[PDB]
Design a protein around this motif. Structure first.
Motif, PDB file in Angstrom:
ATOM      1  N   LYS A   7     -21.868 -12.063 -40.980  1.00 38.37           N
ATOM      2  CA  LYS A   7     -20.521 -11.165 -41.216  1.00 38.37           C
ATOM      3  C   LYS A   7     -19.063 -11.418 -39.690  1.00 38.37           C
ATOM      4  CE  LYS A   7     -22.277  -9.347 -45.183  1.00 38.37           C
ATOM      5  NZ  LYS A   7     -22.425  -8.002 -45.607  1.00 38.37           N
ATOM      6  N   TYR A   8     -18.796 -12.243 -39.838  1.00 35.58           N
ATOM      7  CA  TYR A   8     -17.993 -12.593 -39.308  1.00 35.58           C
ATOM      8  C   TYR A   8     -16.103 -12.692 -39.462  1.00 35.58           C
ATOM      9  CZ  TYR A   8     -15.585 -14.794 -35.128  1.00 35.58           C
ATOM     10  OH  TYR A   8     -14.342 -15.078 -34.237  1.00 35.58           O
ATOM     11  N   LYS A   9     -16.256 -12.612 -40.737  1.00 29.93           N
ATOM     12  CA  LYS A   9     -14.643 -12.511 -40.800  1.00 29.93           C
ATOM     13  C   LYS A   9     -14.831 -11.164 -42.296  1.00 29.93           C
ATOM     14  CE  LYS A   9     -10.763 -13.489 -41.832  1.00 29.93           C
ATOM     15  NZ  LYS A   9     -10.078 -14.782 -40.785  1.00 29.93           N
ATOM     16  N   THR A  10     -15.912 -10.415 -42.057  1.00 27.55           N
ATOM     17  CA  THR A  10     -16.709  -9.266 -42.752  1.00 27.55           C
ATOM     18  C   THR A  10     -16.913  -7.729 -41.658  1.00 27.55           C
ATOM     19  OG1 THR A  10     -17.827 -10.151 -44.214  1.00 27.55           O
ATOM     20  CG2 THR A  10     -17.961  -7.685 -44.818  1.00 27.55           C
ATOM     21  N   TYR A  11     -15.890  -8.103 -40.565  1.00 25.27           N
ATOM     22  CA  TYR A  11     -15.687  -8.020 -39.564  1.00 25.27           C
ATOM     23  C   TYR A  11     -15.008  -5.892 -39.685  1.00 25.27           C
ATOM     24  CZ  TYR A  11     -17.695  -7.159 -34.852  1.00 25.27           C
ATOM     25  OH  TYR A  11     -18.380  -6.813 -33.553  1.00 25.27           O
ATOM     26  N   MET A  12     -15.260  -5.163 -38.947  1.00 27.65           N
ATOM     27  CA  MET A  12     -14.284  -3.830 -39.214  1.00 27.65           C
ATOM     28  C   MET A  12     -14.281  -3.207 -38.114  1.00 27.65           C
ATOM     29  SD  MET A  12     -13.174  -2.048 -41.872  1.00 27.65           S
ATOM     30  CE  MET A  12     -12.242  -3.733 -42.463  1.00 27.65           C
ATOM     31  N   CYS A  13     -13.113  -2.473 -37.948  1.00 33.87           N
ATOM     32  CA  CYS A  13     -12.800  -1.809 -36.801  1.00 33.87           C
ATOM     33  C   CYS A  13     -13.048  -0.604 -36.289  1.00 33.87           C
ATOM     34  CB  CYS A  13     -11.450  -2.606 -35.743  1.00 33.87           C
ATOM     35  SG  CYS A  13     -11.183  -1.942 -34.481  1.00 33.87           S
ATOM     36  N   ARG A  14     -13.934   0.367 -36.653  1.00 33.48           N
ATOM     37  CA  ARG A  14     -14.211   1.743 -36.922  1.00 33.48           C
ATOM     38  C   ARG A  14     -12.952   2.697 -35.119  1.00 33.48           C
ATOM     39  NH1 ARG A  14     -14.530   2.564 -42.304  1.00 33.48           N
ATOM     40  NH2 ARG A  14     -17.033   1.004 -42.591  1.00 33.48           N
ATOM     41  N   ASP A  15     -13.046   1.861 -34.886  1.00 33.73           N
ATOM     42  CA  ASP A  15     -12.426   2.093 -33.089  1.00 33.73           C
ATOM     43  C   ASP A  15     -10.512   2.738 -33.678  1.00 33.73           C
ATOM     44  OD1 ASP A  15     -14.543   1.245 -31.575  1.00 33.73           O
ATOM     45  OD2 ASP A  15     -13.299  -0.494 -31.748  1.00 33.73           O
ATOM     46  N   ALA A  31      -9.277  -7.621 -39.844  1.00 32.90           N
ATOM     47  CA  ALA A  31      -9.383  -7.059 -40.364  1.00 32.90           C
ATOM     48  C   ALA A  31      -9.620  -5.503 -40.091  1.00 32.90           C
ATOM     49  CB  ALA A  31     -11.106  -7.080 -41.847  1.00 32.90           C
ATOM     50  N   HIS A  32      -9.224  -4.679 -40.282  1.00 33.38           N
ATOM     51  CA  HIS A  32      -9.006  -3.390 -39.535  1.00 33.38           C
ATOM     52  C   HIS A  32      -9.907  -2.135 -40.420  1.00 33.38           C
ATOM     53  CE1 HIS A  32      -7.990  -2.329 -35.238  1.00 33.38           C
ATOM     54  NE2 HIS A  32      -7.912  -3.283 -34.607  1.00 33.38           N
ATOM     55  N   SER A  33      -9.229  -2.265 -41.902  1.00 34.88           N
ATOM     56  CA  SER A  33      -9.347  -1.604 -42.708  1.00 34.88           C
ATOM     57  C   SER A  33     -10.030  -2.258 -44.002  1.00 34.88           C
ATOM     58  CB  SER A  33      -8.090  -0.777 -43.504  1.00 34.88           C
ATOM     59  OG  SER A  33      -8.556   0.286 -43.785  1.00 34.88           O
ATOM     60  N   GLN A  34     -11.087  -1.092 -44.804  1.00 32.30           N
ATOM     61  CA  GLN A  34     -11.991  -2.166 -45.249  1.00 32.30           C
ATOM     62  C   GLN A  34     -11.329  -2.726 -46.756  1.00 32.30           C
ATOM     63  OE1 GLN A  34     -13.229   1.382 -48.425  1.00 32.30           O
ATOM     64  NE2 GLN A  34     -12.552   2.250 -47.026  1.00 32.30           N
ATOM     65  N   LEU A  37     -10.671  -6.032 -45.723  1.00 33.01           N
ATOM     66  CA  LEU A  37     -11.807  -6.980 -45.446  1.00 33.01           C
ATOM     67  C   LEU A  37     -12.328  -7.323 -46.879  1.00 33.01           C
ATOM     68  CD1 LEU A  37     -13.639  -6.348 -43.951  1.00 33.01           C
ATOM     69  CD2 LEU A  37     -15.136  -4.774 -45.100  1.00 33.01           C
ATOM     70  N   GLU A  38     -11.678  -7.218 -47.845  1.00 31.69           N
ATOM     71  CA  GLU A  38     -11.828  -7.683 -49.496  1.00 31.69           C
ATOM     72  C   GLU A  38     -11.186  -9.229 -49.291  1.00 31.69           C
ATOM     73  OE1 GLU A  38     -13.388  -6.039 -51.101  1.00 31.69           O
ATOM     74  OE2 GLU A  38     -11.972  -6.097 -52.809  1.00 31.69           O
ATOM     75  N   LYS A  39     -10.467  -9.517 -48.253  1.00 34.19           N
ATOM     76  CA  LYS A  39     -10.071 -11.202 -47.959  1.00 34.19           C
ATOM     77  C   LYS A  39     -11.102 -12.020 -47.730  1.00 34.19           C
ATOM     78  CE  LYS A  39      -5.210 -10.450 -45.297  1.00 34.19           C
ATOM     79  NZ  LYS A  39      -4.547 -10.679 -44.634  1.00 34.19           N
ATOM     80  N   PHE A  40     -12.388 -11.503 -47.020  1.00 32.97           N
ATOM     81  CA  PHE A  40     -13.533 -11.936 -47.145  1.00 32.97           C
ATOM     82  C   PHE A  40     -13.680 -13.004 -48.124  1.00 32.97           C
ATOM     83  CE2 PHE A  40     -16.942 -10.681 -49.970  1.00 32.97           C
ATOM     84  CZ  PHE A  40     -16.331 -10.007 -50.499  1.00 32.97           C
ATOM     85  N   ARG A  41     -13.088 -12.553 -49.612  1.00 30.78           N
ATOM     86  CA  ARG A  41     -13.112 -13.642 -50.704  1.00 30.78           C
ATOM     87  C   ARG A  41     -12.529 -14.901 -50.443  1.00 30.78           C
ATOM     88  NH1 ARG A  41     -12.999 -12.688 -56.918  1.00 30.78           N
ATOM     89  NH2 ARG A  41     -14.299 -14.679 -56.370  1.00 30.78           N
ATOM     90  N   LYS A  42     -12.104 -15.002 -49.361  1.00 24.70           N
ATOM     91  CA  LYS A  42     -10.973 -16.213 -48.994  1.00 24.70           C
ATOM     92  C   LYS A  42     -12.565 -17.407 -48.523  1.00 24.70           C
ATOM     93  CE  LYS A  42      -8.854 -15.951 -44.799  1.00 24.70           C
ATOM     94  NZ  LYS A  42      -9.462 -17.103 -44.326  1.00 24.70           N
ATOM     95  N   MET A  43     -13.337 -16.675 -48.000  1.00 26.46           N
ATOM     96  CA  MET A  43     -14.299 -17.825 -47.463  1.00 26.46           C
ATOM     97  C   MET A  43     -15.038 -17.964 -48.567  1.00 26.46           C
ATOM     98  SD  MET A  43     -17.315 -16.781 -44.917  1.00 26.46           S
ATOM     99  CE  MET A  43     -18.842 -17.995 -44.444  1.00 26.46           C
TER     100      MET A  43
END
Length: 48
Positions: A7-15, A31-34, A37-43
């Protein structure tokens, strides 16, 4: 059952909730926000 074991591209910055000032491309993978994260589809759905 995630698409991939990694889950590299599916990372989240809760900070971002409190802390701040960090590289997005570093680990956040732009991908700082959910929503981002949708961009993960690009993979999976890639055309190139």
């Amino acid at each position: 059952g995630a698409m991939a074991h990694s889950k590299y591209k599916t990372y989240m910055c809760r900070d971002m909730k409190q802390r701040g000032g960090c590289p997005r491309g570093a680990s956040c993978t732009f991908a700082h926000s959910q929503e981002e994260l949708e961009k993960f589809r690009k993979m999976n759905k890639r055309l190139v």
